[PDB]
Write a protein that binds this DNA or RNA. Structure first.
Ligand SMILES: Nc1ncnc2c1ncn2[C@@H]1O[C@H](COP(=O)(O)OP(=O)(O)OP(=O)(O)O)[C@@H](O)[C@H]1O
Ligand SMILES: Nc1ncnc2c1ncn2[C@@H]1O[C@H](COP(=O)(O)OP(=O)(O)O)[C@@H](O)[C@H]1O
Lengths: 577, 600, 127
DNA sequence: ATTTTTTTTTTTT
């Protein structure tokens, strides 16, 4: 025992354990102590702390632990397994066996463009935006071997005398150490990665980054697309002095005390009955079908009676399967078409926020990702976007102005959901409850639309599987042409229109509306009542069943709900003749 | 060493006593300036060194490395003897006589050197070492050799951990680093000795001299010539595999696209008192391109493409556009040859490329480590932050090259999909092109999209135009043979080096915004022309028929610093559009003449 | 060591000078107060005043010393010095002639040898 | 054997 300084016991000698028992004040709740006892409500096997109680206790240890932190934390492992195991039993009647835990630390941040040898082996707060990282494989700490039969005591998370020798004379040097892993221990890993900030010249420079090391409990916690504050360690991996013209080496860090950002109102993504009153006692009003014809364009005029046909769209129809095979097309889609200038871009762009979707078109997902990664050259996939749309739907332009490769998967999803693969020798036959809104700047507008059928030069199929195709124009109406000539200076100027539609009776509140829907589309198996008009006009019946869930009713009739019929007469005049 | 006795004394004799320029020499204050700047890069000029002791030129380059260390130690011994205060938290610089590329040689190794180069694509940033700690395997006591050690071994069985530990251990801690990023060299296309071998060589920088370089851009260096630590030493092939390495001491700008005038300040007033009024559409324009006679149209034309790029985000929609866009159809025979020269010297950002045969397919992202031969290259779009791509013979390029360019005009950006990494590239840039037509050399008032065949979704993004059909006009041709002789008889307003002050200030200060001043007129140019200019060649009216006008009528007034506007300079710019737009339509054309001569 | 270590048949690690030292260990030393060269490299095809049936102007390879360097350009006629010498190879492919070594005999990875030709020069006259 | 590339053929309305 080296009782001069750097003393090897102090912490577990008495100090930190007992400070923790000094973490003990009146209200009889001032504790970092029964924290684990509420972890033992489940056996989470970890605990949280600060770095500003030790400051509230002393000014002596905070500059001390920073030298040997990753030593202190397994010192704390020892502290715990000595302490709580005292608490596993008052008097001699309880202990099955001990176990192991982790500790979580946490104040004020830093950046990355300032940190080097000067601040090495030092614990820091910084922030970026995550990119991607690995899964979880494996680790352990100890086991033993035939050759000596001693535990594989390792400090850090070389390779040895034989000791299969003392049988009289015989030696056996040169290392016959054959590990017996059934004797072993075990830990976790992820090996993480992130990119530095988006505000600190990532443009004229390139973004630098960090490599990381997860341990026990902290994987399955973090997916990229996030923004975090963390602590780590400033360490490297190689040893030294035609690479390295003299001595060059590589950067990384560790994991310690992540604390993430959960910024406010994004996260009904990852992580009341009064609101149900708001749902229903508003739903009792029979004023929602055509009321919201001034809603989905909270800043635009037009599409009014076509917003009348969105009212059925997202609510969906019904996948009324049968005793025999089918799972027919409950899902429903739309088509729109016309020239630029009608703001149909912004119509889809602003719609992004209004359940799950993406808005890109042509040459810039698609199909599968049957490629490799870095890690022992695996081949593992990413799927399609029926993957990413199975109740979520999409709004996507430029069918025609996109590669002709990824067009067998259009009929292989809109008609049947008859999806399949053959890249490697197999049919991953995934499926999904998908639907789509379509837009285009296709050939020659209303001069083409009203008359016959020549829009796409490969198929007439695109009028069959969809129904509601209402034209986009830049019609000349001189009374409104000047308005739309000055419907574009208020848009062009002054940055005012954030929530101008908020005052409206019930044609706003994005969150409540999305939740309106995402309850509504999970009520029951609604239907209708007893009650060129050909087979795919009729196969509109989806909209018939829709008004059950639009009035949030079970049932409805044909011709009160032929509102849809009278709205479809907008489309049928395009391709009646 | 012995002579270093004198050197330190001779240094300390000048860094705070030798003075020019009427006292208080900077060095007495430079130290503390950088000290309060947390910067640590004390700079020197060899001129003043030479003024002190010209003996400082020839005991130096027996080893220029000792000069810099001997200077760094005077620094340390001056810093904390006076500022022991901030001792708990150096290198120096010199920056003056030029030597040339391919003149450093066999003989110019490791001496006093002053040398130049240019940048291109290279690697990221990384750290290096200084210090020897390895031991702890037997006893592993604290031993502590007394230096940070670069390439030094003793390896005893006796070393103070009970003079033991012939075997070995290694540390991964308590370990100094120093960032570093690699270069790529280039040499100028101005100072060409006619197509000799293209310059690229191993050259180096260091931690503080880092994170500043950019491709195809230049920076003058002090520099000193050395070689790689070991260039392929074994009884081997009929040549050694040798390269040679240069390393940076001070980096000194060659470009200065920013403010360029250091301690010109006498002529600076002539810019804003002569390029500020609405007459400057004649003053600044008389000198617009006074080279040859024809086509004063293009003088007015090209003067305003040079001018802008902006956020001014409208209401909550997105970023809308910040770019310029030009294109012409001519015939070689036209005087269209010099298509990119001068205002790109005005341009703070831009990069050149002639036509297909030499057009960029780069216009492809992975991420690697660096073993031997690891590089990748592609499009210049980060570059050209309000810069230009300077081109002739554009019509041959690749549709997918045009994809980025259409996206640059559409969403101010490009959009990668289905790749390993999906990194991006933002497009705040400008474009110039000089293609040739289909079926010949020019097709008449018959349609223009098929006069030269670009495609549908691409050209709608493009903005500026100038077109030359040209029949004969004689007096100017006799003037032009007179111009031939007298221009071949060089027997041997805004000031010329200050016009750039206009790109600095004009676009900078006044950025007017307006309500609809009379812009229901453009409701007419919508609707009337949807009924007037109907079927001759007569589609082309869009939002960019006016959004382009915001792009450039504003430039036309921004020339003036008006700050508030009626229709005057706006439609004077649309006097380009009365001139530019008319060009694309059938000889039943004067629907524009009727419909705009009031807007003329 | 002001000796002649400039060979292709060269070794930086050598044995000793005065005492007995190792036979693999090495220092690295004064590459700074010393004497050097500079050179370049080309290829060249057969002449056109000489043109035979069948055969073609094959390519042949040279390094030349410094004061001749970069004083040339495509398209000239010469009377060089053609002092042909061989490769001191490092490894060979399809060089399956004798495979051997200067290895002592036996009593109480290796190297191989197959070369190819080159040329060299000392003097020029563009004609 | 793969990574970073380029043409010269292989076969054409
Ligand atoms: N109006 C004019 N003013 C002055 N010079 C003219 C005029 N018209 C014709 N020329 C002469 O005609 C010649 C045309 O050929 P030129 O060298 O311009 O081809 P080019 O335009 O450079 O081809 P490209 O632009 O595609 O590279 C010019 O050298 C120019 O001197
Ligand atoms: N009624 C309107 N209100 C606001 N902006 C409009 C209106 N009509 C047209 N616009 C303009 O149209 C532009 C967008 O056109 P866009 O939707 O991109 O065409 P496309 O959808 O074919 O790409 C916007 O910049 C906007 O200023």
């Amino acid at each position: 025992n080296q009782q001069d300084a750097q003393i090897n016991l102090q912490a577990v000698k008495k100090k930190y354990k007992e400070f923790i028992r000094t973490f003990n004040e009146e209200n009889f709740f001032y504790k970092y102590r029964d924290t684990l006892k509420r972890n033992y409500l489940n056996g989470r096997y970890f605990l949280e702390i600060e770095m500003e109680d030790l400051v509230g206790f002393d000014e002596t240890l905070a500059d001390k632990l920073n030298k040997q932190p990753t030593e202190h934390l397994e010192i704390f492992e020892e502290a715990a397994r000595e302490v709580a195991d005292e608490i596993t039993a008052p008097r001699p009647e309880h202990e099955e066996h001990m176990h192991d835990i982790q500790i979580l630390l946490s104040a004020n941040p830093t950046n990355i463009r300032q940190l080097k040898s000067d601040c090495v082996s030092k614990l820091v707060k910084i922030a970026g935006i995550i990119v991607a990282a690995s899964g979880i494989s494996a680790k352990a700490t100890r086991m033993s071997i035939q050759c000596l039969s001693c535990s594989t005591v390792i400090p850090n998370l070389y390779a040895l005398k034989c000791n299969t020798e003392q049988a009289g004379r015989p030696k056996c040097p040169l290392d016959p150490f054959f590990i017996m892993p059934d004797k072993c221990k075990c830990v976790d890993f992820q090996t993480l990665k992130l990119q530095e900030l988006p505000d600190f010249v990532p443009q004229g420079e390139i973004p630098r980054h960090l490599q990381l090391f997860c341990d026990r409990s902290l994987c399955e916690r973090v997916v990229p697309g996030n923004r975090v504050l963390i602590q780590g360690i400033y360490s490297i991996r190689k040893v030294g002095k035609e690479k390295a013209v003299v001595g060059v080496r590589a950067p990384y860090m560790r994991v310690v005390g992540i604390t993430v950002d959960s910024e406010g109102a994004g996260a009904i993504s990852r992580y009341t009955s009064d609101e149900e009153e708001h749902f229903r006692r508003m739903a009792a009003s029979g004023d929602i079908y055509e009321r919201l014809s001034q809603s989905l364009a909270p800043s635009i005029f037009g599409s009014r009676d076509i917003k009348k046909a969105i009212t059925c769209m997202l609510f969906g129809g019904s996948r009324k399967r049968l005793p025999d095979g089918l799972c027919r097309r409950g899902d429903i889609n739309v088509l729109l078409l016309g020239d630029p200038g009608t703001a149909k871009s912004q119509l889809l762009k602003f719609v992004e926020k209004v359940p799950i979707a993406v808005y890109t078109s042509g040459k810039g997902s698609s199909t599968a990702s049957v490629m490799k990664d870095p890690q022992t050259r695996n081949f593992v996939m990413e799927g399609g976007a029926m993957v990413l749309a199975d109740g979520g739907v999409v709004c996507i332009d430029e069918f025609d102005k996109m590669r002709e490769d990824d067009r067998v998967a259009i009929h292989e999803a809109m008609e049947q959901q008859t999806i399949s693969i053959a890249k490697a020798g197999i049919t991953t036959t995934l499926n999904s409850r998908c639907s789509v809104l379509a837009a285009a700047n296709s050939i020659f507008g209303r001069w083409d639309d009203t008359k016959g059928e020549e829009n796409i030069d490969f198929m007439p199929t695109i009028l069959s599987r969809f129904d509601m195709i209402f034209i986009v124009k830049d019609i000349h109406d001189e009374s409104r042409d000047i308005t739309l000539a000055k419907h574009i200076i208020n848009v062009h100027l002054s940055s005012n229109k954030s929530a101008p539609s908020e005052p409206a009776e019930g044609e706003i509140s994005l969150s409540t509306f999305k939740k309106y829907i995402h309850y509504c589309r999970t009520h029951c198996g609604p239907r209708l009542s007893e009650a060129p008009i050909t087979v795919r006009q009729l196969e509109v019946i989806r909209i018939s069943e829709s008004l059950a869930k639009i009035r949030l009713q079970p049932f409805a009739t044909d011709e009160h709900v032929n509102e849809a019929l009278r709205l479809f007469q907008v489309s049928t005049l395009d391709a009646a003749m | 060493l012995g002579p270093r006795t004198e050197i330190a004394n001779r240094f300390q004799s000048f860094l705070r006593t030798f003075v020019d320029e009427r006292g208080a020499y900077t060095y007495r204050d430079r130290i503390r300036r950088m000290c309060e700047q947390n910067m640590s890069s004390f700079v020197v000029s060899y001129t003043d060194l030479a003024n002190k002791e010209h003996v400082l030129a020839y005991f130096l380059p027996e080893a220029p490395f000792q000069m810099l260390e001997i200077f760094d130690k005077v620094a340390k011994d001056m810093v904390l003897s006076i500022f022991p205060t901030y001792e708990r938290v150096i290198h120096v610089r010199i920056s003056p006589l030029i030597e040339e590329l391919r003149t450093f040689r066999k003989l110019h190794l490791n001496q006093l050197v002053r040398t130049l180069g240019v940048v291109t694509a290279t690697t990221g940033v990384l750290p290096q070492l200084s210090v020897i700690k390895y031991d702890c395997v037997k006893c592993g006591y604290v031993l502590g050799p007394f230096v940070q050690s670069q390439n030094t071994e003793i390896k005893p069985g006796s070393c103070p951990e009970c003079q033991s530990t012939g075997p070995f251990s290694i540390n991964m801690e308590q370990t100094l680093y120093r960032n570093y990023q690699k270069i790529t060299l280039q040499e100028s296309p101005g100072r060409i000795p006619a197509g000799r071998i293209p310059r690229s060589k191993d050259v180096i920088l260091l931690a503080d001299l880092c994170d500043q370089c950019k491709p195809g851009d230049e920076l003058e260096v002090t520099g000193i010539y050395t070689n790689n630590y070991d260039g392929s030493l074994n009884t081997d092939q009929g040549f050694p595999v040798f390269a040679t390495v240069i390393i940076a001491n001070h980096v000194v700008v060659k470009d200065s696209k920013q403010v360029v005038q250091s301690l010109t300040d006498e002529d600076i007033a002539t810019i804003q008192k002569l390029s500020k009024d609405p007459r400057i559409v004649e003053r600044v324009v008389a000198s617009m391109a006074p080279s040859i006679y024809g086509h004063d149209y293009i003088k007015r034309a090209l003067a305003l493409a040079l001018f802008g790029g902006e956020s001014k985000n409208p209401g909550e929609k997105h970023k809308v556009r910040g770019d310029i866009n030009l294109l012409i159809c001519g015939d070689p025979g036209t005087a269209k040859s010099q298509f990119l020269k001068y205002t790109e010297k005005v341009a703070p950002r831009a990069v050149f490329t002639t036509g297909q045969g030499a057009s960029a397919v780069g216009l492809y992202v992975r991420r690697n480590p660096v073993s031997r031969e690891w590089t990748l290259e592609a499009g210049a779009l980060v570059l050209a932050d309000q810069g230009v791509c300077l081109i002739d013979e554009f019509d041959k390029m690749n549709d997918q090259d045009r994809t980025s360019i259409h996206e640059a005009m559409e969403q101010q950006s490009i959009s990668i999909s289905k790749a390993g990494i999906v990194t991006s590239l933002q497009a705040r840039c400008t474009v110039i092109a000089a293609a040739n037509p289909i079926g010949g050399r020019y097709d008449p008032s018959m349609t223009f999209s098929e006069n030269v065949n670009l495609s549908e979704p691409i050209l709608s993004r493009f903005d500026v135009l100038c077109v030359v059909k040209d029949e004969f006009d004689p007096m100017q041709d006799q003037q032009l043979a007179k111009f031939v002789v007298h221009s071949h008889m060089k027997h041997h307003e805004i000031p010329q080096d200050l016009l750039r002050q206009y790109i600095v200030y004009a676009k900078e200060n006044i950025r007017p915004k307006l309500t609809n001043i009379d812009e229901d007129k453009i409701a007419k140019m919508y609707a009337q022309l949807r009924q007037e200019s109907f079927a001759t060649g007569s589609l082309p009216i869009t939002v960019r028929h006016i959004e382009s006008v915001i792009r450039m009528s504003e430039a036309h007034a921004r020339m003036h610093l008006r700050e508030n506007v009626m229709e005057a300079d706006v439609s004077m710019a649309i006097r380009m559009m009365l001139e530019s737009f008319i060009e694309a339509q059938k000889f039943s054309v004067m629907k524009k003449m009727r419909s705009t001569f009031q807007k003329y | 060591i002001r000796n002649v270590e400039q060979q292709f048949k060269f070794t930086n690690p050598t044995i000793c000078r005065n005492p007995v030292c190792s036979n693999r260990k090495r220092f690295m030393l004064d590459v700074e107060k010393s004497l050097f060269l500079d050179f370049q490299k080309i290829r060249i095809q057969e002449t056109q005043a000489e043109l035979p049936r069948g055969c073609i102007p094959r390519a042949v390879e040279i390094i030349l010393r410094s004061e001749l360097v970069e004083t040339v350009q495509a398209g000239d006629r010469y009377d060089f010095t053609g002092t042909l010498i061989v490769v001191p190879d490092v490894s060979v492919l399809a060089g399956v002639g004798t495979r051997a070594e200067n290895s002592s005999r036996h009593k109480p990875g290796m190297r191989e040898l197959n070369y190819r030709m080159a040329f060299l020069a000392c003097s020029v006259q563009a004609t």
